[PDB]
């Protein structure tokens, strides 16, 4: 959705990305330049540099203000119209959804997978939104590993090694005789 | 108060006249004659340094004011409908140019598609608007647009007018008046832009679904031999006086195609609707299905709005758009003023609406103070 | 050239009187009904007509080689006659250049290879670009630019052509001697 | 103006938007010091009139008929005025021989009163939709009026009083299935004749009819006499009341008839190296001049310069003597004959003086431009003073810089 609405502030500065193949190189502007001011208002007031980006004809493009307001839109998705709570919202009503003894523990151990966690500076607007709305005088700790992208994988590579393992999967003669449910029962 | 102008700058043609009126005084080429130049500069460009646009907005606007309208600038307001999503700085310079050089009280930048949806009633209406530059359409929904649920395809004029110049130079035949009776190829290595969009609205017209259907796969040539229709008879254009131009009767009902060609992607004017409405909110669907608002020159080519909604059918019947949009009823508006004059109409009819205008319009006061236009991304 | 206006050498043969100058080779049929009051100058192979004419010409006026100043035939029910032409103060036209206008205005430019139409009106202060056509029964307004095939409004003048123009026809008269 | 080829030599402006412009285009500012271009100055409307019958209409009569003339037409076929031709009277072009009868339009018994254009076809619907939308903008203002005050008052809404006819357009209804294209279009011979080209479709806007014989004759486009009025001055020129038929200014003023005007009379070699022979003719009847400046040393923007002209001349008092004078009349001695200066200047007649300018061409490959600037004694009697009552010798004193940027044939 992030790399579906900067197309759209891309053709607001003047470039279109019509095409399905033209949508990928988007991505790669996203993934390449757009960075999250920790305040969005004090940035759009501020004259950008407007950093040029290399396509893979050779042709440059001057991005300016949409590299910052397009991945701000995980954070209020209200701004384009998506109704929605917001990154920092799902992360502080998980938690305050949950018991009242174990808040300050899951407030206190919060880890960020995936590979929109990667924006720069996402770590830093993310620990001030969550403040704001989490109760005063908590520690909040974020805890980024390095390999966030890969992060989901090496888990599942730890957990496959184990013994254990080979109790949880369900065997090919298995879904045979007892089922459809034998995958969802045996899941958890 | 004075009848507030109303001013649509596009890439192809600028409509202009005042508020409150059946039509538009003047609708001219967006090109400017300078001393130099042969062929005249088009005055919107995107994608170039400020100082030069800005001159040539400076040049555009004051022809508009005094040879086309003949009305003192400073005196009374005005309404630039542009559409949505149109380039910041060209926005941003249009505004500048009329605050500072002409020193307007207060300018108005309606979205297009919004004041299309004013000309019928009708408060809620979905709206495309096939112009020069891209094929653009955007939900409005009970006054309010849907930017979420935007679709936009370059299949306007320009990628017709491309399509056209290419078709011409590959079946080219031309009677130059020098021993050129015997059909001679590419004589001239490009042909100018007003040539081609007089042969295209003069010749060219778009075919019937069922004929059209059978000219996409006649001209691949998908394991078949020779299964076109019959084409229309081969009309002949002069060009430049003495060289007539002998066009092709395939190239009149094939240059169009390209606008309703799937191309794989499953990417044409017809599916650019569908696409869009499956993305708008379920609750919406029924409503903006059965008003429709074709707008935009392009459509004008004549049998375009039957192949469209025919084509729009067929989609629909498409495995992907079958569970969604199965079962609903696509029944087009037929706007007041003409599909190139519907967009201007909106802003004339808001014009006439002294009491509001003032209000939502921006002030020079405020523009000279602050040096910020309101737009639809982050203040 | 670069505002200067340039050297012109004429040879004997031409009929200076009364500061008008008038070429041996430009033949003007009807000397009775033509008449020429100021220092004017007709370049040679020019035709000025006297079909039923009265061509009155200005006092600095110009008219360049191989151009015809024709009267246009009026076609009324009452009578069909030539309407007697008026050309006025300061009037420069250009080479080659065929003119069948009634009552052309002072201070003008018509233009090179310019073909001005049938009963035609030119006010004062005007400007005709070179390879144009004016149709039958048209005027143009001061301070204008009439261009193309059609004849119609290109844009408009300098604001100080009544000033200018004198400049022009007046330095071109000096500069225009014999050899 | 374009004989002369003007557009070579020209004047530079001062302000926030620096203008190359010839001295033709320009016009002086009188009530300060700065002569400004048609772009800087701010341009007015004063009177509307038709070009084929010149009658001068005013503002409040051209609003109700469009900016056009009702008694004259211009043709839709070419764009030229039309003429009225009788038999009963039908409309004929002169260039072009399309006739009124062509599309079909009745010949009148009155000459000019009888021919009118249609009425729009969807005027009516408009009325409609436009009292809805005044009535439900009026709601707007109402609500958003009675929210100002509410917020200036800032009681926190106290219901002191009690709180809290209806016009409904219906909405167009929508067709099932648009008429399809006519099956004539296949199989038929197309006449371009028959069909019209876009520029004349789109100069009847209202109904832009496909078919010539629906394409009617629209009235003739009203043009405009423009007037021009400066940012930091005030009035600057106008034009009178009957412009029609009349080249006379109200107020006259161009920058031709206050600054002196400078053309280049001689034209040498371009091949490296020359001596141009150039005019400096005055307007004012006695004032002082100088050429003296070689417009510095990258300043006052010489990027165009290609060539290094020395013009080291020291001022030269001219005079203009508006009367018709003999060739040679009379030798004046302090002005002519004591600066004789035979190398600087080449010829002095009355209201003229040609100087010899060393330019250095061949710096660049082509295109030889050169920079300098020109002094001035501007009398601009800024003061209050009746045919020169006041001294102005303060006026006379100002030297005003005019930086000239000359462009040689090459
Ligand atoms: N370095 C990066 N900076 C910013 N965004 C990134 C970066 N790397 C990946 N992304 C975004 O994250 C996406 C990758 O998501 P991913 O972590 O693979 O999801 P999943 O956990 O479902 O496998 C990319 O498509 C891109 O939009
Ligand atoms: N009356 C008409 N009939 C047929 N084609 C037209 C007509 N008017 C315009 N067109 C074509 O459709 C295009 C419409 O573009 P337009 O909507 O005026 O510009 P923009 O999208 O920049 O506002 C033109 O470029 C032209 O090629
Ligand atoms: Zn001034
Ligand atoms: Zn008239
Ligand atoms: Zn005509």
């Given at each position: 959705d992030v790399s579906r609405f900067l197309r759209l502030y891309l053709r607001k500065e003047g470039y279109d990305f019509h095409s399905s193949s033209e949508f990928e190189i988007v991505k790669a502007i996203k993934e390449r330049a757009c960075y999250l001011s920790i305040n969005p208002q004090k940035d759009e007031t501020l004259e950008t540099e407007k950093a040029q980006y290399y396509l893979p004809d050779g042709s440059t493009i001057e991005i300016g203000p949409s590299r910052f307001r397009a991945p701000e839109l995980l954070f209020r998705p209200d701004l384009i119209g998506e109704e929605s709570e917001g990154i920092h919202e799902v992360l502080v009503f998980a938690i305050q959804k949950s018991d009242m003894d174990l808040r300050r523990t899951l407030f206190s151990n919060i880890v960020l997978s995936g590979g929109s966690t990667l924006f720069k500076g996402f770590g830093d607007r993310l620990l001030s939104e969550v403040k704001k709305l989490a109760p005063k005088d908590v520690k909040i700790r974020i805890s980024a590993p390095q390999e966030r992208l890969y992060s989901t994988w090496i888990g599942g590579s730890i957990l496959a090694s184990l013994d254990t393992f080979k109790k949880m999967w369900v065997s090919k003669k298995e879904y045979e005789e007892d089922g459809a449910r034998s995958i969802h029962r045996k899941t958890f | 108060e004075k009848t507030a102008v109303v001013i649509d700058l596009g890439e192809a043609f600028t409509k202009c006249g005042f508020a409150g009126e059946t039509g538009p005084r003047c609708i001219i080429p967006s090109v400017i004659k300078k001393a130099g130049m042969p062929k005249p500069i088009k005055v919107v460009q995107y994608n170039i340094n400020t100082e030069e646009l800005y001159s040539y907005l400076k040049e555009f606007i004051h022809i508009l004011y005094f040879r086309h309208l003949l009305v003192n600038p400073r005196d009374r307001r005005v309404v630039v409908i542009e559409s949505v999503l149109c380039p910041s700085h060209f926005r941003e310079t249009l505004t500048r140019v009329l605050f500072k050089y002409f020193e307007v009280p207060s300018v108005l930048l309606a979205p297009s598609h919004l004041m299309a949806l004013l000309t019928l009633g009708i408060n809620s209406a979905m709206v495309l608007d096939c112009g020069y530059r891209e094929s653009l359409v955007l939900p409005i929904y009970e006054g309010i647009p849907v930017l979420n649920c935007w679709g936009a395809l370059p299949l306007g004029g320009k990628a017709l007018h491309k399509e056209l110049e290419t078709q011409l130079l590959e079946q080219c035949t031309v009677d130059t008046g020098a021993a050129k009776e015997q059909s001679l190829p590419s004589v001239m290595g490009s042909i100018p832009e007003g040539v081609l969009e007089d042969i295209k609205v003069r010749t060219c017209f778009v075919s019937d679904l069922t004929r059209g259907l059978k000219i996409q796969a006649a001209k691949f040539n998908i394991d078949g031999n020779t299964e076109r229709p019959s084409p229309p008879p081969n009309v002949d254009y002069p060009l430049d006086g003495e060289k007539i131009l002998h066009v092709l009767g395939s190239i009149r009902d094939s240059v169009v195609e390209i606008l309703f060609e799937q191309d794989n992607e499953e990417k044409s004017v017809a599916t650019l609707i569908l696409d869009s409405l499956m993305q708008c909110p379920i609750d919406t669907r029924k409503q903006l299905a059965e008003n429709l608002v074709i707008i935009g020159g392009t459509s004008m080519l004549p049998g375009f709005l039957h192949r469209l909604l025919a084509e729009i059918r067929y989609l629909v019947e498409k495995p992907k758009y079958k569970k969604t949009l199965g079962t609903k009823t696509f029944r087009i508006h037929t706007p007041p003023a003409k599909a190139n004059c519907v967009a201007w109409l909106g802003g004339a009819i808001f014009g006439a609406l002294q009491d509001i205008l003032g209000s939502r319009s921006v002030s020079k006061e405020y523009y000279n103070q602050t040096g910020r236009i309101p737009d639809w991304c982050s203040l | 050239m670069e505002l200067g206006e340039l050297l012109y050498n004429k040879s004997e043969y031409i009929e200076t009187a009364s500061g008008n100058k008038v070429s041996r080779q430009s033949v003007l049929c009807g000397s009775q009904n033509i008449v020429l009051n100021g220092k004017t100058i007709v370049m040679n192979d020019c035709i000025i007509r006297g079909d039923l004419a009265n061509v009155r010409v200005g006092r600095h006026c110009v008219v360049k080689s191989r151009s015809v100043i024709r009267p246009p035939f009026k076609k009324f029910s009452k009578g069909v006659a030539f309407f007697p032409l008026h050309i006025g103060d300061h009037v420069f036209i250009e080479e080659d250049c065929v003119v069948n206008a009634a009552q052309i205005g002072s201070y003008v430019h018509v233009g090179k290879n310019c073909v001005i139409g049938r009963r035609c009106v030119l006010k004062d202060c005007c400007k005709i670009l070179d390879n144009t056509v004016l149709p039958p029964e048209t005027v143009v307004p001061p301070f204008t630019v009439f261009s193309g095939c059609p004849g119609l409004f290109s844009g408009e003048l300098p604001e100080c052509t009544q000033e200018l123009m004198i400049d022009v026809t007046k330095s071109y008269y000096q500069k225009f001697l014999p050899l | 103006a374009s004989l002369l080829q003007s557009e070579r030599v020209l004047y530079l402006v001062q302000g926030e938007k620096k203008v190359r412009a010839p001295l033709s285009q320009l016009y002086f500012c009188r009530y300060c010091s700065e002569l400004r271009s048609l772009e800087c100055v701010s341009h007015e409307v004063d009177s509307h009139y038709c070009?084929?019958?010149?009658?001068?209409?005013?503002?409040?009569?051209?609003?109700?008929?469009?900016?056009?003339?009702?008694?004259?037409?211009?043709?839709?076929?070419?764009?030229?005025?039309?003429?009225?031709?009788?038999?009963?009277?039908?409309?004929?072009?002169?260039?072009?021989?399309?006739?009124?009868?062509?599309?079909?339009?009745?010949?009148?018994?009155?000459?000019?009163?009888?021919?009118?254009?249609?009425?729009?076809?969807?005027?009516?619907?408009?009325?409609?939709?436009?009292?809805?939308?005044?009535?439900?903008?009026?709601?707007?203002?109402?609500?958003?009026?009675?929210?100002?005050?509410?917020?200036?008052?800032?009681?926190?809404?106290?219901?002191?009083?009690?709180?809290?006819?209806?016009?409904?357009?219906?909405?167009?209804?929508?067709?099932?299935?648009?008429?399809?294209?006519?099956?004539?279009?296949?199989?038929?011979?197309?006449?371009?004749?028959?069909?019209?080209?876009?520029?004349?479709?789109?100069?009847?806007?209202?109904?832009?009819?496909?078919?010539?014989?629906?394409?009617?004759?629209?009235?003739?486009?009203?043009?405009?006499?423009?007037?021009?009025?400066?940012?930091?001055?005030?009035?600057?020129?106008?034009?009178?009341?009957?412009?029609?038929?009349?080249?006379?200014?109200?107020?006259?003023?161009?920058?031709?008839?206050?600054?002196?005007?400078?053309?280049?009379?001689?034209?040498?070699?371009?091949?490296?190296?020359?001596?141009?022979?150039?005019?400096?003719?005055?307007?004012?009847?006695?004032?002082?001049?100088?050429?003296?400046?070689?417009?510095?040393?990258?300043?006052?923007?010489?990027?165009?310069?290609?060539?290094?002209?020395?013009?080291?001349?020291?001022?030269?008092?001219?005079?203009?003597?508006?009367?018709?004078?003999?060739?040679?009349?009379?030798?004046?001695?302090?002005?002519?004959?004591?600066?004789?200066?035979?190398?600087?200047?080449?010829?002095?007649?009355?209201?003229?003086?040609?100087?010899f300018i060393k330019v250095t061409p061949q710096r660049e490959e082509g295109d030889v431009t050169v920079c300098f600037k020109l002094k001035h004694d501007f009398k601009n009697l800024a003061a209050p003073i009746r045919p020169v009552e006041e001294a102005d010798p303060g006026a006379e004193v100002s030297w005003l810089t005019q930086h000239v940027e000359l462009s040689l044939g090459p």
């Open positions: - | - | - | 070009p084929s019958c010149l009658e001068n209409m005013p503002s409040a009569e051209a609003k109700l008929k469009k900016n056009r003339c009702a008694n004259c037409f211009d043709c839709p076929g070419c764009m030229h005025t039309l003429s009225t031709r009788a038999t009963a009277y039908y409309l004929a072009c002169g260039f072009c021989r399309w006739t009124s009868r062509d599309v079909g339009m009745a010949d009148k018994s009155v000459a000019s009163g009888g021919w009118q254009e249609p009425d729009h076809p969807h005027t009516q619907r408009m009325n409609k939709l436009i009292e809805y939308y005044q009535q439900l903008a009026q709601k707007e203002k109402v609500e958003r009026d009675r929210k100002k005050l509410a917020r200036r008052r800032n009681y926190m809404p106290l219901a002191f009083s009690q709180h809290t006819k209806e016009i409904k357009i219906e909405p167009a209804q929508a067709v099932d299935e648009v008429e399809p294209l006519p099956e004539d279009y296949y199989t038929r011979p197309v006449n371009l004749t028959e069909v019209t080209t876009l520029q004349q479709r789109l100069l009847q806007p209202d109904f832009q009819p496909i078919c010539a014989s629906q394409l009617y004759p629209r009235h003739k486009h009203l043009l405009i006499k423009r007037s021009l009025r400066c940012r930091q001055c005030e009035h600057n020129l106008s034009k009178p009341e009957f412009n029609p038929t009349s080249i006379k200014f109200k107020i006259q003023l161009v920058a031709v008839n206050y600054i002196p005007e400078v053309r280049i009379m001689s034209i040498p070699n371009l091949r490296y190296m020359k001596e141009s022979q150039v005019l400096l003719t005055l307007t004012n009847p006695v004032e002082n001049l100088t050429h003296v400046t070689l417009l510095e040393c990258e300043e006052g923007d010489p990027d165009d310069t290609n060539s290094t002209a020395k013009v080291s001349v020291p001022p030269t008092e001219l005079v203009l003597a508006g009367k018709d004078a003999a060739a040679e009349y009379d030798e004046l001695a302090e002005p002519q004959d004591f600066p004789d200066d035979p190398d600087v200047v080449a010829f002095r007649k009355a209201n003229k003086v040609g100087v």
